[PDB]
């Protein structure tokens, strides 16, 4: 095809943007978010041994307001931006690696197959990250509908105990997500940096010609 | 998976499954036992019949005047290799005009089993051998493997349920040296008892022995001479 020299620069500047974002993500964002989530694991909020005291029981009726768990809400505010930031930046890594696929050949695709296996592992993490985003919205849909169902049902009290399970399951997921997210940043650094040789240079270029 | 198809291909742990399957072929044969003293050597062979009306197979093969052997494994693989053992021993008396040293014969047995291993398309010989013989240095008990490994032995028991015999061979090993020909038969037949089931034990029909000695050439006994040997032996 044919295109203007400015259109070449529009593509080149785009490739230069992904180069700086992918390199910064590997050598800056990854080591910073690993220790950041490691500090959140060391925070006394996630170190609580007794989960039964972390429940937020609500009255079951000019009715009074029915807030959620103050600790879970505050910890969801910490986990949520890490779920978005990790997901968004992995996508830039998925894009940057995908551009390194050369012209499709009929062989010597092992370096390309390595690139695919890296993308599949990132996609596997990306699905787990999206599952954490569902869990963040799960606590609001589950507890919200269950408390009002426990509000309209005064005969069956154990709905609130099911709401209490949503408290312990959330807090259990809160530390689990922060632990799993930190593991994800660690897996990304281990997969990308170690295989970076085959990611950037998938072909040995041994051609004798 | 894909690595058991032949001998040449090595497993990722560096093992050959076809050699293993050949070494497990020997354990599927009859259980025979043998022992030597400072003077004599006795090979006790267990004979099994294919059916009740069928006669007992021959597990003893005469090789040289001072040499005898018991076969455990595939029957025909022993036969082709017996034609090789006898030919080499006949070649010894054809060339050297002397009885072939039992250690030299077994070394030729291994060399014959080393040939199929390193080459593709050749199967190793899946028969095991317990061989005995007398020479200037006295009697010798040797054992061979389809893996081509061969050892020098005081006494051994090969086949199924052989450890109950080998345990017996360990406790009386001190006596095996100083006993005489009549006692070696008593210890040999009592060693065979441990490899045998709890129902059928000892009959002169399915049990045969052979003996080589100082001035005594290798001689095979079957029934008539074995009957007094079984007499006077508790189990």
């Amino acid at each position: 095809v044919r295109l203007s020299g400015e259109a070449r620069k529009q593509v080149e500047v785009f490739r230069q943007n992904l180069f700086q974002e992918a390199e910064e993500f590997l050598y800056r964002f990854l080591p910073q978010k690993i220790i950041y989530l490691n500090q959140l694991l060391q925070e006394d909020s996630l170190n609580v041994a007794d989960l039964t005291s972390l429940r937020a029981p609500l009255d079951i009726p000019k009715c009074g307001f029915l807030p959620g768990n103050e600790k879970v809400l505050s910890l969801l505010a910490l986990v949520k931006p890490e779920v978005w930031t990790l997901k968004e930046k992995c996508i830039l890594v998925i894009t940057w690696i995908q551009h390194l696929i050369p012209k499709i050949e009929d062989g010597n695709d092992f370096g390309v197959a390595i690139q695919e296996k890296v993308l599949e592992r990132v996609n596997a993490v990306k699905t787990k990250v999206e599952a954490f985003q569902t869990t963040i919205s799960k606590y609001f849909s589950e507890r919200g509908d269950a408390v009002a169902k426990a509000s309209k049902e005064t005969h069956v009290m154990d709905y609130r105990a099911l709401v209490h399970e949503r408290d312990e399951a959330a807090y259990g997921e809160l530390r689990a997500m922060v632990l799993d997210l930190r593991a994800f940043y660690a897996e990304l650094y281990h997969i990308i940096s170690s295989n970076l040789e085959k990611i950037v240079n998938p072909k040995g270029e041994e051609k004798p010609s | 998976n894909q690595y058991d198809n032949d001998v040449t291909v090595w497993s990722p742990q560096g093992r050959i499954h076809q050699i293993e399957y050949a070494m497990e072929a020997v354990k599927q044969g009859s259980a025979t036992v043998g022992l030597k003293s400072k003077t004599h050597a006795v090979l006790v062979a267990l004979k099994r019949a294919q059916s009740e009306l069928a006669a007992h197979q021959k597990k003893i093969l005469h090789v040289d005047n001072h040499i005898g052997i018991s076969i455990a494994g595939l029957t025909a693989d022993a036969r082709l290799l017996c034609n090789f053992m006898r030919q080499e021993c006949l070649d010894s008396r054809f060339v050297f005009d002397r009885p072939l040293p039992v250690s030299r014969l077994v070394s030729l047995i291994g060399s014959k089993t080393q040939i199929p291993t390193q080459r593709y398309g050749r199967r190793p010989y899946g028969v095991g051998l317990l061989i005995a013989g007398y020479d200037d240095m006295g009697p010798h008990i040797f054992q061979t493997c389809p893996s081509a490994n061969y050892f020098d032995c005081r006494a051994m028991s090969i086949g199924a349920r052989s450890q109950s015999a080998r345990t017996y061979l360990e406790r009386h090993m001190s006596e095996f040296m100083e006993c005489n020909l009549n006692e070696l038969v008593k210890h040999g037949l009592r060693a065979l008892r441990e490899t045998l089931p709890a129902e059928q034990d000892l009959t002169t029909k399915n049990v045969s022995i052979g003996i080589v000695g100082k001035d005594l050439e290798f001689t095979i006994y079957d029934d008539d001479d074995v009957s007094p040997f079984l007499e006077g032996l508790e189990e």
Partner: protein, 240 residues
């Protein structure tokens, strides 16, 4: 993947995994060591006792290729005795050709060349055994060479084959072996054998030692039982 099936088929990284797997089989073999000095070369091998039912002297691990050439093999015993006679045929054909004993460097080359010949063909299999070759002469002197399963020979002031090797090689580097005499070297060989073997997996063993040098008059000779027990007592001074 199918790339490691035959030795004639290269890996995607340009390697032969069939030769590698033959090397992994050597790592399961018992430990054997050797050391060369000005007086000669000292051999030692750990011979594991498999059962009490085996006669003394059985499963001899000290191989004699030629009058002045000793050998110690760690690996598959089947391929060991094969190459053993083949190495003797090369030394015998040498004498049948040039009328004297083949030098150790020339013998290690011809043997290693025949080891590498089976790595090329897919219709055969490479050797699963590794060994060392010592020799001594008045014109050459003490020499020690080791051939791997890939058929490559390297000159060594000392070497270790079998399971434990790198651990025994570092213990040899901690002391100068050149000025020593074979009488003092066998004291260190038995000392290393007791260090390598402990009771965890294996049960019992026997010391098989061999000498070549001035003491043996330049000829390959096994160590007698009298000196072997005395050499153990020197190692029993410290181990015990």
């Amino acid at each position: 993947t199918g790339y490691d099936l035959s030795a004639s088929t290269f890996s995607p990284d340009g390697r032969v995994f069939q030769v590698e797997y033959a090397m992994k089989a050597v790592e399961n073999s018992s430990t054997a060591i050797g050391i060369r000095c000005k007086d000669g070369v000292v051999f030692g091998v750990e011979k594991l006792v498999l059962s009490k039912l085996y006669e003394e002297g059985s499963n001899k691990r000290l191989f004699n290729v030629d009058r002045h050439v000793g050998m110690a093999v760690a690996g598959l015993l089947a391929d060991a005795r094969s190459l053993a006679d083949i190495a003797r045929e090369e030394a015998s054909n040498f004498r049948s050709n040039f009328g004297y004993n083949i030098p150790l460097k020339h013998l290690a080359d011809r043997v290693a060349m025949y080891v590498h010949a089976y790595t090329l063909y897919s219709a055969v299999r490479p050797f699963g055994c590794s060994f060392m070759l010592g020799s001594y002469s008045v014109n050459d002197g003490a020499q020690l060479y080791m051939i791997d399963p890939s058929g490559v020979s390297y000159g060594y002031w000392g070497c270790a084959i079998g399971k434990a090797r790198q651990a025994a090689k570092t213990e040899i580097e901690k002391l100068q072996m050149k000025e020593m005499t074979c009488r003092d070297v066998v004291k260190e060989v038995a000392k290393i054998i007791y260090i390598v073997h402990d009771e965890v997996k294996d049960k019992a063993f026997e010391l098989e030692l061999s000498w070549v040098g001035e003491i043996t008059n330049g000829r390959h000779e096994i160590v007698p039982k009298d000196v072997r027990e005395e050499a153990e007592k020197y190692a029993k001074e410290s181990l015990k």
